[PDB]
Amino acid sequence: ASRLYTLVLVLQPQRVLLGMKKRGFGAGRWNGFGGKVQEGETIEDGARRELQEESGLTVDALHKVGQIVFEFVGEPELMDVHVFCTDSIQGTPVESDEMRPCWFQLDQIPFKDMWPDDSYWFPLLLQKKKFHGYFKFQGQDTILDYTLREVDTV
């Protein structure tokens, strides 16, 4: 009933890396790096793979920080997004035809140009909290209803 996705935030003490997606689903918004998990791959391995594909960066250990389920009314499949963070990467962020990376100071996170749910859970990430969330959307701009709770085990 749900499809697995990953989302990785490279979050360091004073800055966070986001990428502006150029095409496809979510294009035109700043976000972390991620995508669909493949057959025979663990969620964390898929998170690591997608970070490389989309940003050019190599991460070793990833830390689980959240799970968010998205419902888009009128679409049957829920999107089960597993969120991870890291403070330690190798490589320089790469701009490609699919993605434009940029570092942001923590006070300048571009919420108006991000998915609207990020305004709810990104501040929990910044304060090193973990969470379970569920957001029901109509279209890509309107949150009809949501739940969001902090957890000790993701």
84 is an interface residue for ligand BSW by CB under 6 A: no
Residue 116 annotated in ligand binding? yes
Residue 34 annotated in ligand binding? yes
Give the residue, chosen from 9, 18, 31, 48, that forms a contact with ligand BSW under the rule CB under 6 A: 31
User: To which residue do tokens 């490389």 refer?
Assistant: 52
Q: How far is the CB of 45 from ligand BSW (least distance, A)?
A: 18
Give 148-151's long-range contacts (Cβ < 8 A, gap of 24+). 148/120, 148/121, 148/124, 150/124
55 is an interface residue for ligand BSW by CB under 6 A: no
Collapse the DSSP code of 153 into the 3-class scheme (helix H, G, I; strand E, B; otherwise coil) and give the result: coil
Give the residue, chosen from 10, 81, 85, 89, that forms a contact with ligand BSW under the rule CB under 6 A: 81
Collapse the DSSP code of 65 into the 3-class scheme (helix H, G, I; strand E, B; otherwise coil) and give the result: strand
* Number of other residues whose CB lies within 10 A of the CB of residue 59: 22
Kindly list the residues in this chain that would bind ligand BSW in the complex (CB under 6 A). Answer: 5, 7, 25-26, 31, 70, 79, 81, 115, 117-118
